[PDB]
Amino acid sequence: PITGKVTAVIGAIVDVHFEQSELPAILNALEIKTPQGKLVLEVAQHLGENTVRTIAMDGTEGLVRGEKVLDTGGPISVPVGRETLGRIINVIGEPIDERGPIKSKLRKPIHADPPSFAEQSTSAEILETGIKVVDLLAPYARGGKIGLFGGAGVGKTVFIQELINNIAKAHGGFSVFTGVGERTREGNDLYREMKETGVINLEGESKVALVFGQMNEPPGARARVALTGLTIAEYFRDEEGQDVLLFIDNIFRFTQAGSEVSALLGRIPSAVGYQPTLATDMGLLQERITTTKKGSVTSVQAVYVPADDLTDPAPATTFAHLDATTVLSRGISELGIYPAVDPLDSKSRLLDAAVVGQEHYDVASKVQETLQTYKSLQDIIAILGMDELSEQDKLTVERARKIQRFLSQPFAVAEVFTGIPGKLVRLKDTVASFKAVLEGKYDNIPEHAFYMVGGIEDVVAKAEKLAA
Amino acid sequence: NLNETGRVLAVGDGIARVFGLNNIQAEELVEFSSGVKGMALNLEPGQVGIVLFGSDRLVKEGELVKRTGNIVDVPVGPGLLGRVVDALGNPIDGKGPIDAAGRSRAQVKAPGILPRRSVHEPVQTGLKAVDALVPIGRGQRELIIGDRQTGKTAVALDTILNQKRWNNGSDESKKLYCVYVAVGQKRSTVAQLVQTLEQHDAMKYSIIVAATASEAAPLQYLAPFTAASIGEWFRDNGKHALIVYDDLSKQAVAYRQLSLLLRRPPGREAYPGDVFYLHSRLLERAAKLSEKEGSGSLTALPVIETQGGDVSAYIPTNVISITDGQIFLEAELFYKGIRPAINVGLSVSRVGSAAQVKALKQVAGSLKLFLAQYREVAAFAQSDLDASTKQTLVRGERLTQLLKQNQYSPLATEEQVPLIYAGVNGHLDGIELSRIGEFESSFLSYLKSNHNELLTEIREKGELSKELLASLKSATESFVAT
Amino acid sequence: ANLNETGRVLAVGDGIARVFGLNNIQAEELVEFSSGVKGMALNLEPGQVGIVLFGSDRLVKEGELVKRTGNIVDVPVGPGLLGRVVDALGNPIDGKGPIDAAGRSRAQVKAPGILPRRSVHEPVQTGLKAVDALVPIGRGQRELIIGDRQTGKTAVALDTILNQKRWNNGSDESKKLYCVYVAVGQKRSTVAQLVQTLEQHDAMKYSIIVAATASEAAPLQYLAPFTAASIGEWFRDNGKHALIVYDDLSKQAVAYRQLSLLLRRPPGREAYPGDVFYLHSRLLERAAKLSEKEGSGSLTALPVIETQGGDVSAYIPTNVISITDGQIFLEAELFYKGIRPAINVGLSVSRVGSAAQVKALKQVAGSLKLFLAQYREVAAFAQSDLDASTKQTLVRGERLTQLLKQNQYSPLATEEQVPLIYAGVNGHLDGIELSRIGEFESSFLSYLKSNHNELLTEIREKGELSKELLASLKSATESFVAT
Numbered sequence A: 001p002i003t004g005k006v007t008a009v010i011g012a013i014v015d016v017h018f019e020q021s022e023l024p025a026i027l028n029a030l031e032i033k034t035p036q037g038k039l040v041l042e043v044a045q046h047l048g049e050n051t052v053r054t055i056a057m058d059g060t061e062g063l064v065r066g067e068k069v070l071d072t073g074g075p076i077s078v079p080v081g082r083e084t085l086g087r088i089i090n091v092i093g094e095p096i097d098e099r100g101p102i103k104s105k106l107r108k109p110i111h112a113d114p115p116s117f118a119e120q121s122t123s124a125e126i127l128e129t130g131i132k133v134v135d136l137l138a139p140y141a142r143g144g145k146i147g148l149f150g151g152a153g154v155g156k157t158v159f160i161q162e163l164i165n166n167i168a169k170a171h172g173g174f175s176v177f178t179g180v181g182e183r184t185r186e187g188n189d190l191y192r193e194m195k196e197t198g199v200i201n202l203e204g205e206s207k208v209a210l211v212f213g214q215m216n217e218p219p220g221a222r223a224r225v226a227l228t229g230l231t232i233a234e235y236f237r238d239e240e241g242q243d244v245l246l247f248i249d250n251i252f253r254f255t256q257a258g259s260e261v262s263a264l265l266g267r268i269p270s271a272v273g274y275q276p277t278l279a280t281d282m283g284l285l286q287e288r289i290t291t292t293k294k295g296s297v298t299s300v301q302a303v304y305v306p307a308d309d310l311t312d313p314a315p316a317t318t319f320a321h322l323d324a325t326t327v328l329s330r331g332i333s334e335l336g337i338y339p340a341v342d343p344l345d346s347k348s349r350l351l352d353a354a355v356v357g358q359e360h361y362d363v364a365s366k367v368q369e370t371l372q373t374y375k376s377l378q379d380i381i382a383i384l385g386m387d388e389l390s391e392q393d394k395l396t397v398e399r400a401r402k403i404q405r406f407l408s409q410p411f412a413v414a415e416v417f418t419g420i421p422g423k424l425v426r427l428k429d430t431v432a433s434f435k436a437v438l439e440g441k442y443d444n445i446p447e448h449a450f451y452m453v454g455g456i457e458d459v460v461a462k463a464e465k466l467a468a
Numbered sequence B: 001n002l003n004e005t006g007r008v009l010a011v012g013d014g015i016a017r018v019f020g021l022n023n024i025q026a027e028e029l030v031e032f033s034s035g036v037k038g039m040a041l042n043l044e045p046g047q048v049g050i051v052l053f054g055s056d057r058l059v060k061e062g063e064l065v066k067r068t069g070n071i072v073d074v075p076v077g078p079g080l081l082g083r084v085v086d087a088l089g090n091p092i093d094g095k096g097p098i099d100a101a102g103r104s105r106a107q108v109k110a111p112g113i114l115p116r117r118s119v120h121e122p123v124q125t126g127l128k129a130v131d132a133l134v135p136i137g138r139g140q141r142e143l144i145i146g147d148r149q150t151g152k153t154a155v156a157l158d159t160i161l162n163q164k165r166w167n168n169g170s171d172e173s174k175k176l177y178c179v180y181v182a183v184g185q186k187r188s189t190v191a192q193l194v195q196t197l198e199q200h201d202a203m204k205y206s207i208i209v210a211a212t213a214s215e216a217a218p219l220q221y222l223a224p225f226t227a228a229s230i231g232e233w234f235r236d237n238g239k240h241a242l243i244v245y246d247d248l249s250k251q252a253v254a255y256r257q258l259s260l261l262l263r264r265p266p267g268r269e270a271y272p273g274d275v276f277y278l279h280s281r282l283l284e285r286a287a288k289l290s291e292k293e294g295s296g297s298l299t300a301l302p303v304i305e306t307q308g309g310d311v312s313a314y315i316p317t318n319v320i321s322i323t324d325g326q327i328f329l330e331a332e333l334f335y336k337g338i339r340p341a342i343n344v345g346l347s348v349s350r351v352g353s354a355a356q357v358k359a360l361k362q363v364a365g366s367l368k369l370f371l372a373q374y375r376e377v378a379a380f381a382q383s384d385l386d387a388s389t390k391q392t393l394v395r396g397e398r399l400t401q402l403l404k405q406n407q408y409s410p411l412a413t414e415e416q417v418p419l420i421y422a423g424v425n426g427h428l429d430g431i432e433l434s435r436i437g438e439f440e441s442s443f444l445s446y447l448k449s450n451h452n453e454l455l456t457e458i459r460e461k462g463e464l465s466k467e468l469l470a471s472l473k474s475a476t477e478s479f480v481a482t
Numbered sequence C: 001a002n003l004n005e006t007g008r009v010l011a012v013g014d015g016i017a018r019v020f021g022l023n024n025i026q027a028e029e030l031v032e033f034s035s036g037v038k039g040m041a042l043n044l045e046p047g048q049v050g051i052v053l054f055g056s057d058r059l060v061k062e063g064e065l066v067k068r069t070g071n072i073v074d075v076p077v078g079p080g081l082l083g084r085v086v087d088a089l090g091n092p093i094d095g096k097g098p099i100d101a102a103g104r105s106r107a108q109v110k111a112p113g114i115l116p117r118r119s120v121h122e123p124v125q126t127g128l129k130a131v132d133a134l135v136p137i138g139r140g141q142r143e144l145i146i147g148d149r150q151t152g153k154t155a156v157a158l159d160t161i162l163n164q165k166r167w168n169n170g171s172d173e174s175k176k177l178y179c180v181y182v183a184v185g186q187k188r189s190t191v192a193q194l195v196q197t198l199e200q201h202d203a204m205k206y207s208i209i210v211a212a213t214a215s216e217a218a219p220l221q222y223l224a225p226f227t228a229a230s231i232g233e234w235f236r237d238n239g240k241h242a243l244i245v246y247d248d249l250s251k252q253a254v255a256y257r258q259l260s261l262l263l264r265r266p267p268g269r270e271a272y273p274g275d276v277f278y279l280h281s282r283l284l285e286r287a288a289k290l291s292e293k294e295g296s297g298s299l300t301a302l303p304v305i306e307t308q309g310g311d312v313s314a315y316i317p318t319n320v321i322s323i324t325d326g327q328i329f330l331e332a333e334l335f336y337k338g339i340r341p342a343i344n345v346g347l348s349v350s351r352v353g354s355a356a357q358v359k360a361l362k363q364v365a366g367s368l369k370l371f372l373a374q375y376r377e378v379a380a381f382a383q384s385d386l387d388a389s390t391k392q393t394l395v396r397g398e399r400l401t402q403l404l405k406q407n408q409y410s411p412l413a414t415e416e417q418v419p420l421i422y423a424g425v426n427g428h429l430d431g432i433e434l435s436r437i438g439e440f441e442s443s444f445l446s447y448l449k450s451n452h453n454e455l456l457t458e459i460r461e462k463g464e465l466s467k468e469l470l471a472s473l474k475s476a477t478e479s480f481v482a483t
């Protein structure tokens, strides 16, 4: 057992002294037993004269110079495998839900090498989500990164819950939700909502694992949680060969946390006050999220934009890794469309013939071109009248108005709140369903038969109820 | 000795660098030969950095320094009610000793993910605008934010004034005890405030923590954490406290002073890399506890002062992203007459409806809208306006005027919903704009004279039954006609 | 305990190891640490040497042994690297085993001076209609690819490397153009997928990939382009021609600023160090066309720069603009509209290309350049009159616009380009619907491929057009339109 002594305390910065060449490596976790639990320090620098500089993972009030520090002989480690599902886990891998210890198979370190260039998969591919708007228009990349936009009032946590459910039921993959700089009141919220919705079942089978690095944790803890949680997702790919989901809310708080830690360690800040290591820090997270030959980690990350300046380093860096976006907009939810996805603001890199097939692309494309023409016709409808349109354009507003209501979908997890049983719409369904409307096969169908329905067979069925 | 004592190596700018104290805990309190105190923030190899609690004319090189063996703490408990203390809980009001239930540290871990319950009970501010549109619940952290001289303290104060309704009661579970944290205000200003609270009989349920403008920086930086423990006594014993940090701009500034003097790496605006953690540590301590844990509550109204509206400034950004919403005030609206100068467009409570008396929610559901659309069309109030868009202009005008409110005059919920019922449903459209003042005034006194029963049902059941809406619809038209 | 070929680590942090000893070390000499990770001796002082780590700080500890190499940072070069993918130090990462190297150039090598050079005269035919007609690239030239993110920057480089399939299959040595793709700060996944495309189109056999991806130690990203330059240079130095693509320099300069800040170099504009210009300038100077006396080898560079919100006025963009011999600017506005390649005509220029562009294109694209820089102008002023004279020029403008849209992975030979341009400039498309111009192309190609194949053969071999041949295409086009 390798012991040291604390020689300095400066806020979240702790300096610790060892014996020659008996120093912990940089990134190793060190421990100090406290009255309450255990203060964990992560080694950041070797200063020389057998001292190392560490960042605390918890408060340092009351530490005394000369206190015994222990080397753990490795990075911070977390319990992995199915035992984590349904549990709440902090940065240092402790359970924080008063359900005793996570009796897990192994613990992996939170700092891991990304997959080798040779290990990398060579073809981009779609992760089918069962959500129409997503699959048709802004499809997610299997093993990629999706930026998610919009806050409360847009059903974020249901959308996030729906993806956990679908991914598990449709591809047999579990999810990890990481709260980075999570508001505690809202962590307490989410936990209680996940139990109500079924995605957590303290008795049954839980589809998600929870990791929280709360706002009131110091900069060290907030910087590292995304990793903690990520590692959990990694093992499901590395050992069970699953298509995992990873949730980061919020990725910006990941960047600010790094910003804060760098500042604390005395590094000269870079442009706009950020860390000089902003880009490699982002890499060292993101590059671990990918398809391998075993499976894939697909990460949906909530993205906040400072000052609404798209060119701020924080977003600018993040956007360099995002394969696609899903924009939830109050402008959509006010029209009663759930999910509240913006069909034109949400975009994908994978929306390309060579990735999705020529058919899929062509449906999506005209679906997108129709909604645009509709948008630029809203202003003349408000002042002139519905009758001031050309033969083909009075047909395509009638068409879009339908397409629009067809993009809404009842979610399975939201049934406890809605009473409406939920649809999981297969991709092949979604392409064919919209292909059929675009040709004009269903102009005879009234508009209300498109609201909250799955496949085209549900449009055929519902229209007959609203008549006979 | 050296383990429990030290010698002053250097002193200046309220920092004393001290040799020895080899057994001192980080953030521990010390004592200088002259009797001035300070806390150890910097444990370094050769020496300890200590920040002084008083003038540094009183420390000299060579001087002897003693450990106290205490992390900074404060008296707590009900014996603090009606008192004005400093940051360390010393009485400054001249009413003698403070009777403390026990003691608590300035720094306490916030309640976890587990020992909490979703916010669900109204903190009723009595401000028509706030309660109807930016409702605050118990356990919430709702920021009051704006430029200087826009009514920020006034909003918090009127809230404190409003708690009289329940604080004069016997029902402990309905009371809301109040903690006002004056950080860096001037002494006369604080005295002025205290005089005001006395004048409206609100001192009795308040505690005032005052680290004024001329007090050493670390007292100003401690004050919000200290006050939090004082308020936390209530939450921890199944009661409910409201805490107002007036204001966290000035605290941030104090914290920065120490950091720059202790030569810690500076960042944006010369703030230390842990200045976010200063405010998150603090503001996470407001919480609604679960059943198991006594269901107590602390609600936080931090204040932030912006510079010419810039919410992108470093500290505004930190607090805005830490809390649960903003009540946003504006000079524009102020001089226009709209007081409180709440910017409805840029204000929100993320807790929302779960924090709002059902009765109010029922009338206020629409009000959120009739104003939203009013803002989207407000530009048109300059000749050729069609039927639909003029109608929305008539309501908006009137509903804006309805939300105007005199200072130190919070309304009861059962006084609020009638007024908003009248506005929302169109009973004011007839009444000319300059008279909506006297309208509210008489309408309530006419309701008290002749319809006391409905008010009582609103007050006691909090809901509106279909029968009540009808009783309200009739009462209103009745009065409007005269 | 040798303290001349060997040192002990004093301290390590922020990507810098401080080592005691190594008395006989050279400046910029590579070192090897206990753990196997390598480093560069950056600054030598009394009492210690500062070493920049080519890996994670984790891998170095205080007390560990550090070994000399007697090698200034260098790389394996030669023809054996064709078809391989290596990292910044030249380490094989495609999993294909030991690199077959003819030798080892230094990473930093000085550029050829005033005398060993000669004016560009040979073309790098991109196979891109927009590029080769408007902003032509000569062998030995440096042209910058620049625009916002997600604007087809890579696709212009890529379809160029692809297009060399035509020549690198033949015997003719002087016409062979070997490719070097330098991925700097990109995702691993992307680069792997890209390499997948290069193989899918066979092009991998003549190209070399050097990659320092997004998660790799900043100094490995700072180094990549230089070592890639060394590799590209072997072909220049030996009499052949190599093309080098730096994707992208923006990310490199970002990697560079990181080190400088961590080293405590004064931040300047946008917090970049004072010498960030020098970083790029020394690199792109190595792209040259050599004289008769030096084998006539050519290195051609296509640096990629990423603008933020289309602002070409930023520090780094203007720096690289001021080093290159022109830039192809790709407008995000056109790219979203569908116009791809999204070349902005006014903002794009090649500074030396004209005198190197194949003469055949030069004639049929008569003033095409100055014209499209003016149609675009009168177009914005159109949205006060439905005027007569400017109305026909607008139809010409739109037909030439729609004519320059081109698919990715579809590069065309010069002989396919020339007639397409002839049909536009000379107004043979003005009678055709807007939404049909794309179909016109391959049908007009079908026609030239199965009937007038004799004109197409001529263009390839000459590189010109005779008066006789000009009147020949005249007839061929007009017949097709009416059917």
Ligand SMILES: Nc1ncnc2c1ncn2[C@@H]1O[C@H](COP(=O)(O)OP(=O)(O)NP(=O)(O)O)[C@@H](O)[C@H]1O
Pocket: B147, B148, B149, B150, B151, B152, B153, B154, B155, B305, B339, B340, B405, B406, B407
């Ligand atoms: N609701 C109200 N109606 C009318 N007047 C008001 C109202 N609220 C505040 N005022 C007056 O407006 C002035 C400023 O209010 P105050 O509550 O001090 O704002 P503030 O933001 O705290 N200013 P400061 O603390 O000096 O930066 C005082 O003169 C108040 O009396």
Ligand SMILES: Nc1ncnc2c1ncn2[C@@H]1O[C@H](COP(=O)(O)OP(=O)(O)NP(=O)(O)O)[C@@H](O)[C@H]1O
Pocket: A349, A352, C148, C149, C150, C151, C152, C153, C154, C155, C156, C306, C340, C341, C406, C407, C408
């Ligand atoms: N001529 C084209 N027509 C249609 N799509 C294209 C064309 N060229 C490129 N694309 C696609 O458009 C997307 C972005 O272009 P890309 O070549 O990646 O440019 P870039 O500027 O390198 N983007 P990034 O590297 O992410 O900043 C890619 O998915 C391309 O496959």
Ligand SMILES: [Mg+2]
Pocket: B152, B153, B154, B246
């Ligand atoms: Mg005030």
Ligand SMILES: [Mg+2]
Pocket: C153, C154, C247
């Ligand atoms: Mg690219």
